[PDB]
């Protein structure tokens, strides 16, 4: 039994976050931000059921492809089926290292969280010491457990989602960047979405496993459609005269660079190219630019004005409207 | 034996949101304030008795129900009623007694179809009230550390307690709970006199006092029992549905986790009633006990928490 | 042996009050908080030759009582006469959970102490975890030994009595509140006393088992004292009409009020039994409301008072004796 | 080999109230509080040469004298030859409680102590550990050993030397009133007597066991003076007068508790029998009152006064020169 | 699986101290602070390979760990901050055409990894040479007294507590002209490696306004010549 | 494998100061504090290459010489050889309390420091850590453990010579208060003589072996003249006049405590002793006395006057010229 993902009202943009994100295990980690409640929970738990089936070998955490590349394990020994879904790798609050990666095999947390969805509690709470060994693997690419005179290396490539919360501040900018880009999360304040709300929570309730069926099109109409748009990837192109413009914008906002401007054209051909048209556009990029490193800034409290107006107003006039 | 349930006097708040969650186990667990020395304890452990008997499979350690889905744990795969016991954690106990690891479902799987209950919450040991109340709020359980998927349906209520002057919890999870109630310390002698009447009559004749108000038991036993079925008959029309959530759009209340109780609850206000048709009025009586605890959640001067979620309500609903 | 109890000189207001709790040891336990070196911890361990008998099972693994309505012994709901003298059992600061409980059972210093005195020095420097035990233990009326795969619940029906400094720290609010009918106990003045102590003692060094020699035709009678109050303990009489003087007090206070009450209505009118009336009278009452409630009073930490006398203060708008 | 005690020049007070327990194990704790370097712990270490022997039961269980009431060994009391000199130890800076109470039965350190002498050095440190277990076995004379499930009492008495440095903070003031002398160490400020003392102790360094072969009759001389004021420790008589002026003077200085009180009168009767007089005077009161009773004062730094300047104005305006 | 080593686009500064630390073990090492994200360990695991024991320390705030210090607190202790190699700054990248083919750079890479090393294979292998004869140098390479009463000249200007600040250049400055062919070194080669060192052993103490090389540049000119 | 000890060129307070302490092993060690860089622990490691020779019992359990009587360890005395090679000892910062003492035959570290050298790195760290149970054999022979059942004693007489940076803070009394030997070492300043420090480190380090073979007959003429200082050390005589300045100048300066005499008697003995020459004058008074006395002097917590010259403005003035 699970919750519909569709079935959702409004949040549009937390959704555009994973339909960007989805597609591509390589853009990065991506933060949702918003207050306690609106569902943030059964969103992501939402996600689980819409993919492909994914291939295990027979039944190992890290269950990446039985062929693929990279598959660095004792099992190639024996190289020298079955197919399965998503599972959530959900770890509690408070959490210690013993599981997380392991000791003098056992396995770990991460074993099992490769190539899954790893949805971590909130980060302002956790300390840094306990999760800063190893926040996001998928850039070192394998596990790592040199330190106690171990040499074992496994895959750990899996997409991060940060779920924080605003009430106690948030992560230290050194900390907030190499994870990717914010997303903000409404309130409905309209009586007619909240009683929706309520009617819709109030029905699956009472019939759980018949409310699925008056909304099964659209489940694999969305399922159908990122499937075509996945092999559409390696064919988008982008002009050269474009690829600089971004860069007499990006200066200006004083970005730490490097990784800022390398995130932006890496999910360029993704939101323009997912629609099914190859040729990317100008305004296509207006939209996947004001939530995206807008998030780095620089960490100016002492102002009080629209910061969003900040990345559209500078990026007007480079773009010429 | 133990004290009667109906022989407490002069408490009605806390009697009623407990009777309320005694009916339907989906609203929630139901936290209690007030000030110590004013008898909290006594009626928590005065409900263990006034209960209908409940069947079991095998006397299992689940101990949920012999049919019925969602009891996957070895119970339907292919048995006397007795009643439901009421648990309590010990002082001082991790998650060793609370789940274990090698099954030995103690403290939980007992309480499973059950009561369990803790008191000070205020400063209670951390790291084990978010595990048990996620798991409430949650289908069956989380055993997944060892490899294992034993999940039992862990399906009881919650009720917790502290004191207004030792600190409060934290946000993060009060807003999560259930219903809030408060009590206070009866001002009146002339109601305290009887207090101490009992707890000085009853202690030398138990077996005297067991039958001294048996009738009203007999007539609350089958009371609910009654209402029981009751329930899903209630219906609730489309603008007084949208009549309420107005003075929470017009306050500030955080997501709608908080909106979802007084539908879940108002209806059941009328279940041992009578009613089948929701009233005015009545929403008052309830929509008091329950949100309230959220409010604006900005403490900086002497605010009174009942005022801004009556006075505001009654010119939404015409008073 | 030990000091002669009547022996001590002065002091009439701790001895007045911890005596009368042999008399019924429903009442809670009972602790004192005074100057260091002025006459406690000696007089509390020359109670043990003041103790009547009591019924005891044969051989009494439980050490409760074999000839009441509730007994739930090891060998009374399975199986279904004896007299011993109540014992008094001490604990220090060294030991810890291993031997205050114990398992493989054998029974713990706790559990084998039984409606009767349970002495423990130095209160306020007691080490936590030891008090967490006996924060509701002793007010509930049984223990947990559910570790080691069995469950067994020992008695907790007993009275323990403590004795520190108020200079090294304050206890919990909650053990201020726990414990009911207390005392305090300041320095001695008169001259004539001071010689006399110090006197006794160098009299007494001279020869131990000569100087209670004296005093023995003396010490005996008063065993007899308090069994007349075990007989004439039912019976006693207090009109309704008094009730509500002893409880109008407590709301002029803002106190609890659901334990001071109860504490005097349970020994106002057992103090009468070791005096001998059967009425009570509104002077029999004065010498021990103050004493007890006193621990329990809320004041503003930045007012400076004596609730000693604050209690009383308000004493005579009621009735005014 | 140590240094001997009849070698050290000076210091002539803390030289007379040091082998004056030596008298009787009865009068309480010795303080000594100076500065570094004046011979602190050099004296103290000398007195292992100058103490009587006093019988005691064979195979030493406890240390009890063999005819004597209160033995309450309950091992060999319930049957009811070698004497023996008494014993010297030391506890390190710090430890744990295995050895200060005993465990696996194997007697614990405490119990060598009893009848004895026991040291400790830098007594401003050990401080809330260690510490409260040795609160009981003073002023009390008993304690109880229990845990592991062995269950032993103790008869524990003897008495106790301080040391330390004066200006690392303070003692806590429960353990501070099991003590019942105190002493302060000054250096010489005079530049013949300084040569003196350094040409004394360097020769010593020359040849160890020569140096004290000429201080052997000095030394020997005086244990006959102890000796015989143990023998004429009874028969000591007080004037009543003398009584009640004795413990009149603490009135007016407030002593806290009539505790350390009673210390002054059993300390005259020991000086006086150092003589030879069988009748106490007048002179045997100032020489001894203001060196224990002069840490058993609450002044605080509120007053510009200290020493015990107000001990002797107080005295003197009662009564003497 | 790696990156090219001599595609990394930079400044070459922290390339020249790489390289001088990897030419002469016991010089320290060479720490890197003052940014986040630019090349620290990227550089850092390229260093790892193309070339004794090489290690890396990472959230500071025969073996040589070059380490890489936090950039937003700074530095430690400066008691403990001795004992290590010169210290550099991070340049941060501003021309627009720099960022445009330094973001065209690691695409082709996440296209095709196991090509990407051929591609710049044929010069980096040079690399692999320069410094392979090079170490059959330094026995051969002298100095003149002359300059070694110049050295600690400007040490002894300024305070330089700690006589460290007039070995390791020695040891460095050495080591620079002794990889390209030259015997002698320049009257100005000591320019290249003085300004570089001496940073952090300077005891900073922050009583005005001061320039990380301001001082090292016109102290230095000031006396050893314009 | 190391820097030879005759080749250090300036600061020639350590080559003093650490090499007379070697002559009598009495004094307590040096206390030397500087900059990082300049030396400070170089020559400490290059004594462990000359040092002199004295004999041990066999099989050395604490580190004892077997013709030496009265040490009384533990098992010498009832029974009351090979001239081996001294070593000092060094202990890492990382320790516990129960690493430095032996316990649950188990040794402990010690047992190697009996007659030895100990050496402690910044010393000014490490509070309460390891330092409160070292202060056994610092001004007295002998610790007493007793840990876990089993009691020694310890007959360890180490040297203590220390070291550390003193920018971070001073240290509490009782700790520096038992250091003889301190110096003050400062950085050069010198063009000559920095390039000259300079240039030898480098063929040092190419050719170890040609430096030493270079610097080999100062050692064997250093060791030659400490053994001969050594063996000539006694049969030195002092006169009355010296001996009553000595004791003047320190009551005069008003060094607390009386440690501050004895020293520096020692050191002069034993510097004219290193010259040769029997008889001892006004010479090595001069030289050695704040050396010896400086960091003894602790009475200017307020004060801004330089500490150098305060010991020489009074010793003038009242010794010789
Ligand atoms: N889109 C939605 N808007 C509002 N409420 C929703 C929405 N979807 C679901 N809900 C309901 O809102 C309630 C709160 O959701 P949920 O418990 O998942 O919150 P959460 O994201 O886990 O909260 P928190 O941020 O406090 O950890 C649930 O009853 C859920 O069914
Ligand atoms: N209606 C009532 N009002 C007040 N007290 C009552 C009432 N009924 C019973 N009591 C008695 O009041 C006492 C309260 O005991 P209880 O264990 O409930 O503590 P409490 O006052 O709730 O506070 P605490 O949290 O400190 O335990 C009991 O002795 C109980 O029998
Ligand atoms: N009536 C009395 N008044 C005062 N002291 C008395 C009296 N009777 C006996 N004493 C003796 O006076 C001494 C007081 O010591 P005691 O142990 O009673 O003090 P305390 O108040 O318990 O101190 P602490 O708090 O330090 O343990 C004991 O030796 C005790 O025997
Ligand atoms: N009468 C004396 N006064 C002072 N010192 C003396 C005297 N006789 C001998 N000494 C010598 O003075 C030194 C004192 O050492 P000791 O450790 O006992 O002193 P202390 O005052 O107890 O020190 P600390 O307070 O630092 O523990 C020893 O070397 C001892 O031989
Ligand atoms: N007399 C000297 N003065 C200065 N430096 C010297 C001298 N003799 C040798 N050196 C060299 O100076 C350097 C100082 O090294 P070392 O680490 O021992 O110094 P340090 O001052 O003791 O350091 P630290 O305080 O950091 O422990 C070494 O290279 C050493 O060979
Ligand atoms: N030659 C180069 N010049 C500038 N930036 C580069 C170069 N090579 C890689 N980068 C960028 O540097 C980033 C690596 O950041 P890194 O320095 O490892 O972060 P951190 O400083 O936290 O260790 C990569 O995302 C890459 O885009
Ligand atoms: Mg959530
Ligand atoms: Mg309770
Ligand atoms: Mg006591
Ligand atoms: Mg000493
Ligand atoms: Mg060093």
Chains 1, 3, 4, 6 share one sequence.
């Not at 569709?6 to 960007?20: C, F, P, R, S």
């Not at 989805?22 to 943030?40: L, N, S, Y």
Request: negative net charge; contains cysteine; hydrophobic residues 40%.
């Amino acid at each position: 039994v699970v919750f519909p993902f569709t079935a959702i009202v409004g949040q549009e943009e937390m959704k555009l976050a994973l339909l960007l994100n989805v597609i591509d295990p390589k853009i990065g980690g991506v933060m949702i931000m918003g207050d306690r409640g609106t569902g943030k929970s059964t969103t992501i738990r939402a996600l689980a059921d819409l993919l492909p089936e994914i291939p295990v070998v027979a039944n190992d955490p890290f269950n990446s492809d039985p062929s693929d590349p990279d598959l660095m394990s004792d099992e190639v020994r024996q190289k020298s089926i079955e197919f399965k879904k998503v599972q959530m790798v959900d770890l509690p609050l408070g959490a210690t290292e013993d599981r997380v990666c392991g000791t003098i095999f056992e396995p770990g947390l991460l074993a099992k969280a490769n190539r899954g969805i790893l949805y971590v509690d909130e980060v302002n709470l956790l300390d840094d010491h306990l999760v800063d060994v190893l926040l996001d693997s998928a850039a070192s690419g394998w596990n790592t457990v040199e330190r106690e005179g171990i040499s074992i290396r496994h895959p750990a490539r899996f997409v991060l989602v940060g779920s924080g919360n605003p009430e106690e501040g948030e992560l230290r900018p050194q900390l907030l960047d190499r994870f990717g880009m914010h997303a903000e999360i409404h309130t409905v304040k309209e009586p007619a979405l909240r009683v929706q709300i309520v009617e819709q929570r109030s029905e699956f309730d009472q019939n759980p496993p018949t409310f699925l069926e008056k909304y099964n099109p659209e489940q694999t109409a969305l399922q159908k459609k990122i499937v075509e748009a996945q092999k559409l990837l390696p064919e988008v192109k982008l002009d050269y005269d474009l690829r600089v413009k971004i860069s007499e914008v990006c200066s200006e906002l004083d970005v730490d660079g490097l990784r800022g401007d390398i995130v932006t054209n890496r999910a360029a051909k993704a939101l323009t190219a997912y629609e099914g048209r190859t040729e990317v556009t100008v305004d296509d990029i207006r939209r996947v630019i004001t939530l995206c490193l807008r998030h780095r800034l620089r960490k100016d409290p002492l102002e009080s004005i629209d910061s969003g107006y900040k990345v559209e107003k500078v990026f007007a006039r480079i773009f010429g409207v």
